C-alpha cells in the first residue's frame, strides 16, 4: 500500500507504454478524472491469477 | 484486443479519447472478435495504426 501525495496525476504518460487489460472506476466516471483531484491516494499493488 | 473495453459509452483511454469516441445517448451494438489468425504475420503487422 503505497501512499501518492502532492503531485500530478496526468495519465498520458502511461498510454505510451501501458496497455491495461482492465480498467474500472467505481465512484467516479474515467472522463471526469482529469477534472477531479483528491483527497488522500493509496496504490493497492500485488500480482494475482 | 485490451483496448475493446473503451468501445463504449464512458469510457477513456489512447482510443475513446483519441482515434474513436462514442456519443453517450447511443443506440446501436458493438461487434468485436480476434484477428489474429488475419491481421498479424511473422516480423509483425504495422499496416495498423
Not at chain 1, 467505481?26 to 483531484?37: A, E, F, I, Q, R
Not at chain 2, 446501436?28 to 484477428?35: E, L
Amino acid at each position: 500500500r503505497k501512499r501518492i501525495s502532492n503531485c500530478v496525476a496526468d495519465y498520458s504518460v502511461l498510454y505510451n507504454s501501458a496497455s491495461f487489460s482492465t480498467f474500472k472506476c467505481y465512484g467516479v466516471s474515467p472522463t471526469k478524472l482529469n477534472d477531479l483531484c483528491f483527497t488522500n491516494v493509496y496504490a493497492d499493488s500485488f500480482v494475482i491469477r | 484486443g485490451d483496448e475493446v473495453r473503451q468501445i463504449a459509452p464512458g469510457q477513456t483511454g489512447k482510443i475513446a479519447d483519441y482515434n474513436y469516441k462514442l456519443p453517450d445517448d447511443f443506440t446501436g451494438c458493438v461487434i468485436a472478435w480476434n484477428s489474429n489468425n488475419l491481421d498479424s504475420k511473422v516480423g509483425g503487422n504495422y499496416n495498423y495504426l
